[PDB]
Amino acid sequence: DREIQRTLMELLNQMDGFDTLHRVKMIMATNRPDTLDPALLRP
């Protein structure tokens, strides 16, 4: 349960590392968006 939060932190850091130039885009799909951490919800 710990490793999942520590990994979400790394996902957040790698996501925020997106410079404007990369031709890289991302899709996330879920059936229970309420359970999703509000950290991701931030613009």
Binding site: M9, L12, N13, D16, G17
Partner: protein
């Protein structure tokens, strides 16, 4: 002969050397170091090493075989680095001045304001509509 001997001393700390972390010194000729292999060892210090560099967490280099401490290596968390500048802000000049006095000068020059003796600034409040 002394030139030969000193050349050998220099030859001791040549590559490859295993990096580790410095624990507190024991005596003038020895100290305890924890190699990056994970293990800890009680190791002779090479007498050429300048002692002042031996901070209790410094990164050091040890002989690969004997683990001999032979070199001292010369030494952010996230996107917490904001990467945005006052040039990017849309002209909030009054707020720019207020915040810059409130935090920026305390971050840069808190030692003078400690010389004032005031426990230099600790907290500011920002209020207004969102966005």
């Amino acid at each position: 002969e002394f030139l030969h001997a000193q050349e050998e001393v220099k030859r001791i700390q040549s590559i490859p050397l295993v990096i580790g972390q410095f624990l507190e010194a024991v005596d003038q000729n020895t100290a305890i170091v924890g190699s990056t292999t994970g293990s800890n060892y009680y190791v002779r210090i090479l007498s050429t090493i300048d002692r002042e560099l031996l901070k209790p967490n410094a990164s050091v280099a040890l002989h690969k075989h004997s683990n001999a401490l032979v070199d001292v290596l010369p030494p952010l968390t996230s996107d917490q680095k904001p990467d945005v500048m006052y040039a990017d802000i849309g002209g909030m000049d009054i707020q720019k001045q207020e915040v810059r006095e409130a935090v920026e000068l305390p971050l840069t020059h808190f030692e003078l304001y400690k010389q004032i003796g005031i426990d230099p600034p600790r907290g500011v409040l920002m209020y207004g509509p969102p966005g």
